Structure 1
Amino acid sequence: VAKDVCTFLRWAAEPEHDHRKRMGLKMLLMMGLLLPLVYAMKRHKWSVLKSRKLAYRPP
């Protein structure tokens, strides 16, 4: 009786609970996809600079 009423009072206080968590999963997955992709795009553009070598050639 206590377990059930608590579960209801949880839903009372936070109806969004189930939707919230559905969105959480979809966020975690998209971020799982986009973060390493955007990170790869970053390293790609920056690779011109990461590779570069300098030389000082006074006369």
Structure 2
Amino acid sequence: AEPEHDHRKRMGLKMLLMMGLLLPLVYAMKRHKWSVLKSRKLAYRPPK
């Protein structure tokens, strides 16, 4: 019923390993660019 059984699990292992690498690296690229905004500071100086 499922001749692809073994091959799909071998691929599944490779998919998990690549995701364990790519997810934190892509997460790191997101945080890298966004850090400009996440640490920005604002000040309001109206005339008096």
Give 5+ residue unaligned stretches, structure 1: 1-12
Which protein has the bigger strand share?
2
Task: State how many pairs are aligned.
Answer: 47
**Structure (1 or 2) with the larger CA radius of gyration:** 1
What is the TM-score when the length of structure 2 is the normalising length?
Answer: 0.96
Instruction: Give the number of the structure whose residues are more often helix, by fraction.
Output: 1
- What is the TM-score of this pair, normalised by structure 1? 0.79
What is the CA deviation profile of residues 11-58 of structure 1, one whole-angstrom value per residue up to 9, with x for unaligned ones? xx0000000000000000000000000000000000000010000000
5+ residue gaps, structure 2: none
How large is the RMSD of aligned CA atoms in angstroms?
Answer: 0.3
Q: Greater relative contact order: 1 or 2 (C-alpha under 8 angstroms, separation 6 or more)? A: 1
